[PDB]
Design a protein around this ligand. Structure first.
Ligand SMILES: *[C@@H]1O[C@H](CO)[C@@H](O[C@@H]2O[C@H](CO)[C@@H](O)[C@H](O)[C@H]2NC(C)=O)[C@H](O)[C@H]1NC(C)=O
Ligand SMILES: *[C@@H]1O[C@H](CO)[C@@H](O)[C@H](O)[C@H]1NC(C)=O
Ligand SMILES: *[C@@H]1O[C@H](CO)[C@@H](O)[C@H](O)[C@H]1NC(C)=O
Ligand SMILES: *[C@@H]1O[C@H](CO)[C@@H](O)[C@H](O)[C@H]1NC(C)=O
Ligand SMILES: *[C@@H]1O[C@H](CO)[C@@H](O)[C@H](O)[C@H]1NC(C)=O
Ligand SMILES: *[C@@H]1O[C@H](CO)[C@@H](O)[C@H](O)[C@H]1NC(C)=O
Ligand SMILES: *[C@@H]1O[C@H](CO)[C@@H](O)[C@H](O)[C@H]1NC(C)=O
Ligand SMILES: *[C@@H]1O[C@H](CO)[C@@H](O)[C@H](O)[C@H]1NC(C)=O
Ligand SMILES: *[C@@H]1O[C@H](CO)[C@@H](O)[C@H](O)[C@H]1NC(C)=O
Ligand SMILES: *[C@@H]1O[C@H](CO)[C@@H](O)[C@H](O)[C@H]1NC(C)=O
Ligand SMILES: *[C@@H]1O[C@H](CO)[C@@H](O)[C@H](O)[C@H]1NC(C)=O
Lengths: 120, 396, 192, 204, 99, 99
């Protein structure tokens, strides 16, 4: 915010704009990547109250209201990873990502591959 | 429209400008003024030596209150060969040399710079181009005893000619001898200014020559007694000791962030909404044109509808408790859309319909029919092939 | 220096080589143009600014310079396009040559000011009469043959105008026939 | 005779609060594990700047003289502790080399069981003093451990120095331009350091 | 609106060339951005100081474009390799690779 | 050490931003890196001649950062396309593709 400097900066033209245009393309792509990966599933499936999966025990990987919706293992993973310049929020919050991983997992347990090929 | 260099705008969110909280006032803090220059004793003295042998002294980095010499109109005379006494109080002597006695005879005014005569060239020296000003007090008040210059010999200032002198003891500093507090150019420097201190407000500041802008705040940071300011991991200054009362302030950068305009396409409406990225809405009604200028722009600042979001302060859109597919994205689960009598709404996006699959240990669902489905997929394969003659582009 | 005189120059052929080759001139510094090239160009206006100063002051006549002349009498704009010309004029030496010693603030580029108010460097509110460190603001050079930086020097500044306005003062170059459709080198009014 | 410096002689390089951080800086520092001369007075070169220490609890060591000649002609530092105060002057006399009992001045200023340690350096016309006082057990070599010296005094006096002497157990070592990594704790004190040139691991 | 991927490729090439042209209007700290002004107003030794500012700025302008075209071409190649793979596996065969 | 890939994304973003901030303090051959010094110590033409070095250095430093982020983003996109493919074939199906 020096005035004399900010006048001299005009002599260079479109450089302090194609920088913002380039970074904006990167910023939008990070929201696209997150949607390409997690948003496979069209409906938010959720597991039944009963847990009679033939002896298999998914309680470590399913959601838990005592753990945000994150599973027990998702809580390990979220603990083990640790100006003129601004950092912008993602479009999807961690609670929305956790609902997609829940929906994918609950479909997979209850309905095989069929929730990808059609209705579960 | 100016951001996109066009009179048509398609539906989207466009960054157009940067919001930046302005410094509301300027503050200065420096240590308590002390160790003033002693030479005012020479101006207050009732006597001085003659121009053949004017006594002399030196400053020792002492506080030169030179603006007091602008008030020295109690002197019988004055002279200058450079900057004003206010400019001297705004500066420092590059050389220490200072007055202790009087000029006399034709050189009688050599208590001050800009003088001329034999004594003014050496034994009561005061150059015709010495970089300052001084007052002079006559033989009737300070420059000499009752013998005047006639008792002796005459033609930095008022300090160190061989001719028999004759300037009168009773006269003013032109016809009599003259003497005063004086000097000519780190040797002796002007007094440090200061102001009162403000907290929780964006200000411009100086502390001991550390300068910047910020919201100053009280802090618990434990500086050691000799330490005067503190630094960030990236070396930026972020805490200071107030030199007049030795508490530790914490310095916060005044709020700034991108301004983004949410718009439907200009076919649908000329109505828009505005997002101040990372700002907290109480910190708007401040700074740029968007608050300052017109009803039409400050509608998107100072009222209408205002809504804090995790992405920033959003203005001119209506919050809704329903949830929908994301039309225009904002951030942190928030999206906006134009809806029906019509306005821009803002809402939390919906991931999809909720469903519980009817699972049980002995139930299966089998399809009894099918549909053939034909689906489109599109991929780019090639760019526009280009060649640039760099000699023709650069040198024309 | 306080009554510095501007003459507009227009509607002519010119020859700057006559000026540049004259043995009369002690300086001929040009800004934004080279003195050799002036005879190839054509200008939308020319203005000549002129006054007398002591010889040491001539160095203040530049864009971005400082000192009493620039502060209180005559200053060039920071992108000035033109030439500064000066010479000794000892035959003029004389106490008529006023300049301004102090001002309430520094004057603007190509500004001029007749004001005669008593300024105050001492603390007294002197209110239009002289006294202890308060003074009448126009005083004059003591031009005498006994003076080198104190000697009288005559000054001219040529200011050149390069607008989108029509060509109005040209160097001594000659026009030719307006050829068309061929690949040609060309020069219209200095647009090569 | 010689003794080891170990890791003594670090000092606060500037008047700045850095906290819970590692900072890298280049200055005149005493090199780690370098040799140090030992003495029980002689006249010594000042070099680029001095580290000084002594076993003390008595004020046998009254202070120091510094200059180019350090005598008889030209402005020269006299630094003294006389129990009434620490006292400093810049005089040019041919005054006594040991003016204490049977145990021009244009600037002037006033203010075993243990060791006292000091650093003297002279940069951009300013003469700078850093110091510490501590208990000790070993007296015949510098005690192995860590302690950062802090600024006392910072004087505009502009005098040249190339030579100095002690006014009558004491130690002298010399500063060199080196890069050090300094560990500032949560309370803004230096608590550990690495001499970056010392060995390949320190460089790493 | 279905062809947004293909129309985007056309738009990016147009904006890159139009930006590369518009930088010819910029001064880069020379007395003019038009090269024949410098060559007509100034004699040889004085002119080189101005021309080297324009050479420096125009060369950095062109290096910026070529670098972003190299990165943009690699993104299109990753798409062309995928399209070639979809043609071999989907058109010339029948694929069991889900979605 | 299990999550080294994700921790490296965090570290590279922080390292890049920290370096872009530290380059504010460099001289680039100018009289000072604190802009008010150059403005206050010098006459207008000398100040403008000195400031253009800081503008050049900071502008070159910022183009260096953005180019590095463009190349780093293409690497992350190539991994996001692999994760979208893994989810489609492995979670929503049963891939026969060895390893
Ligand atoms: C599913 O497995 C979990 C552990 O993976 C079982 O819960 C744990 O059971 C033991 C013994 O009762 C306790 O010590 C742990 O504290 C339990 N953990 C939690 C989080 O409760 C769970 O009981 C198993 N359930 C079924 C139906 O097999
Ligand atoms: C506006 O409407 C016209 C048809 O009336 C259409 O061709 C054009 O693409 C629309 N523009 C936008 C920005 O949607
Ligand atoms: C400065 O002076 C005031 C009295 O004038 C006093 O209250 C304050 O404590 C002083 N501060 C210092 C650091 O000397
Ligand atoms: C800043 O936002 C928080 C909620 O995010 C709120 O508690 C706080 O009061 C806001 N600050 C101001 C000054 O309004
Ligand atoms: C929206 O929900 C909030 C609580 O989250 C409630 O106070 C408010 O009255 C609701 N508004 C409408 C229009 O239903
Ligand atoms: C199967 O679906 C088609 C429409 O897709 C319908 O015409 C047909 O009658 C259906 N057959 C049965 C047996 O449901
Ligand atoms: C330096 O230190 C070594 C031991 O590290 C010692 O043997 C040697 O005598 C010392 N040399 C000097 C010149 O101090
Ligand atoms: C000791 O210092 C004090 C000032 O601190 C001084 O008055 C006194 O004369 C000194 N005495 C000796 C013997 O140095
Ligand atoms: C002042 O300088 C002279 C030599 O010019 C020297 O003899 C004298 O001792 C000095 N005086 C003091 C107070 O050091
Ligand atoms: C101080 O020493 C420098 C050389 O290191 C020399 O140029 C200078 O003249 C000396 N000044 C005095 C007062 O001895
Ligand atoms: C740091 O300071 C606190 C008080 O602010 C004190 O209780 C603590 O003991 C100190 N710790 C160290 C290691 O200096």
């Amino acid at each position: 915010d020096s005035t004399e400097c900010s006048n001299l900066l005009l002599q260079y033209g479109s450089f302090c704009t194609q920088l913002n245009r380039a970074l904006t393309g990167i910023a939008v792509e990070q929201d696209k990547n997150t949607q390409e990966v997690f948003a496979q599933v069209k409906q938010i499936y959720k597991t039944p109250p009963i847990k009679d999966f033939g002896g298999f025990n998914f309680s470590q990987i399913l959601p838990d209201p005592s753990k945000s919706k994150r599973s027990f293992i998702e809580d390990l993973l979220f603990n083990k990873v640790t100006n003129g310049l601004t950092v912008l929020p993602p479009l999807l919050t961690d609670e929305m990502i956790a609902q997609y991983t829940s929906a994918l997992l609950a479909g997979t347990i209850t309905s095989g591959w069929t929730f990808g090929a059609g209705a579960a | 429209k100016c951001t996109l260099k066009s009179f048509t705008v398609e539906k989207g969110i466009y960054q157009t400008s940067n919001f930046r909280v302005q410094p509301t006032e300027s503050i200065v803090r420096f240590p308590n003024i002390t160790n003033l220059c002693p030479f005012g004793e020479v101006f207050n003295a009732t006597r001085f030596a003659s121009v053949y042998a004017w006594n002399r002294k030196r400053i020792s980095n002492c506080v030169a209150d030179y603006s007091v010499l602008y008030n020295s109109a109690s002197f019988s005379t004055f002279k200058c060969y450079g900057v004003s006494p206010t400019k001297l109080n705004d500066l420092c002597f590059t050389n220490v040399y200072a007055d202790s006695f009087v000029i006399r005879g034709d050189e009688v005014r050599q208590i001050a710079p800009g003088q001329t005569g034999k004594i003014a060239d050496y034994n009561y020296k005061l150059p015709d181009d010495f970089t300052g000003c001084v007052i002079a007090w006559n033989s009737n008040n300070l420059d000499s005893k009752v013998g005047g210059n006639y008792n002796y010999r005459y033609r930095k200032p008022f300090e160190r000619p061989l001719q028999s002198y004759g300037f009168q003891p009773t006269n003013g500093v032109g016809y009599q001898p003259y003497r005063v507090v004086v000097l000519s150019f780190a040797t002796v420097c002007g007094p440090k200014k200061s102001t009162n201190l403000v907290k929780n407000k964006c200000v411009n500041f100086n502390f001991n020559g550390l300068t910047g802008t910020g919201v100053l705040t009280e802090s618990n940071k434990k500086f050691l007694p000799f330490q005067q300011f503190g630094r960030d991991i990236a070396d930026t200054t972020d805490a200071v000791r107030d030199p007049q009362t030795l508490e530790i302030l914490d310095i916060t950068p005044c709020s700034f962030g991108g301004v983004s305009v949410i718009t439907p396409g200009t076919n649908t409406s000329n109505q828009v909404a505005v997002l101040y990225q990372g700002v907290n809405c109480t910190e708007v009604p401040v700074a740029i044109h968007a608050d300052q200028l017109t009803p039409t722009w400050r509608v998107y600042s100072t009222g209408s509808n205002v809504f804090q979001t995790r992405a920033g302060c959003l203005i001119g859109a209506e919050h809704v408790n329903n949830s929908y597919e994301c039309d225009i994205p904002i951030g942190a689960g928030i999206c906006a859309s134009y809806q029906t009598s019509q306005s821009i709404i803002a809402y939390t996006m919906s991931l999809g319909a909720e469903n519980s699959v009817a699972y049980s240990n002995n139930s299966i669902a089998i399809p009894t029919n099918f549909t053939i489905s034909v689906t489109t997929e599109i991929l780019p394969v090639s760019m526009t092939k280009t060649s640039v003659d760099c000699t023709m582009y650069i040198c024309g | 220096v306080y009554a510095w005189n501007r003459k507009r120059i227009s509607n002519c052929v010119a020859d700057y080589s006559v000026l540049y080759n004259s043995a009369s001139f002690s300086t001929f510094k040009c800004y934004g143009v080279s003195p050799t090239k002036l005879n190839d160009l054509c200008f939308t206006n020319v203005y000549a600014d002129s006054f007398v100063i002591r010889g040491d002051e001539v160095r203040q006549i530049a864009p971005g310079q400082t000192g009493k002349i620039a502060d209180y009498n005559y200053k060039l704009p920071d992108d000035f396009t033109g030439c500064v010309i000066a010479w000794n004029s000892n035959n003029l030496d004389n106490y008529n040559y006023r300049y301004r010693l102090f001002r309430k603030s520094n004057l603007k580029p190509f500004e001029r000011d007749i004001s005669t108010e008593i300024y105050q460097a001492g603390s007294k509110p002197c209110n239009g009469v002289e006294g202890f460190n308060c003074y009448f603001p126009l005083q004059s050079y003591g031009f005498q043959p006994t003076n080198v930086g104190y000697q009288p020097y005559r000054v001219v500044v040529l200011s050149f105008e390069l607008l989108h306005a029509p060509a109005t003062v040209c160097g001594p170059k000659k026009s030719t026939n307006l050829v068309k459709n061929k690949c040609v080198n060309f020069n219209f009014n200095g647009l090569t | 005779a010689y003794t080891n410096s170990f890791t003594r002689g670090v000092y606060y390089p500037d008047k700045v609060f850095r906290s819970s951080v590692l900072h890298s800086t280049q200055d005149l520092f005493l090199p780690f594990f370098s040799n140090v001369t030992w003495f029980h007075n002689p006249v010594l070169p000042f070099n680029d700047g001095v580290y000084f220490a002594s076993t003390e609890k008595s004020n046998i060591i009254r202070g120091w003289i510094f200059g180019t000649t350090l005598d008889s002609k030209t402005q020269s530092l006299l630094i003294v502790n006389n129990a009434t105060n620490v006292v400093i002057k810049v005089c040019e006399f041919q005054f006594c080399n040991d003016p204490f009992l049977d145990v021009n001045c244009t600037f002037e200023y006033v203010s075993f069981k243990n060791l006292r340690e000091f650093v003297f350096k002279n940069i951009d016309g300013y003469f700078k003093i850093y110091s510490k006082h501590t208990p000790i057990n070993l007296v015949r070599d510098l005690p192995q451990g860590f302690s950062a010296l802090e600024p006392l005094v910072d004087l505009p006096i502009g005098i040249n120095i190339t030579r100095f002497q002690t006014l009558l157990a004491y130690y002298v070592g010399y500063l060199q331009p080196r890069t050090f990594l300094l560990k500032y704790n949560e309370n803004g004190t230096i608590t550990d350091a690495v001499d970056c040139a010392l060995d390949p691991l320190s460089e790493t | 609106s279905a062809l947004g991927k293909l129309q985007n490729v056309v738009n990016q090439n147009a904006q890159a060339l139009n930006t590369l042209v518009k930088q010819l209007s910029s001064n880069f700290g020379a007395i003019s951005s038009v090269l024949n002004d410098i060559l007509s107003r100034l004699d040889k030794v004085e002119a080189e100081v101005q021309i080297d500012r324009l050479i420096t700025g125009r060369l950095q302008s062109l290096q910026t474009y070529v670098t972003q075209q190299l990165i943009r071409a690699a993104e299109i190649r990753a798409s062309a390799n995928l399209a070639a793979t979809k043609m071999s596996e989907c058109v010339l065969g029948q694929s069991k690779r889900v979605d």
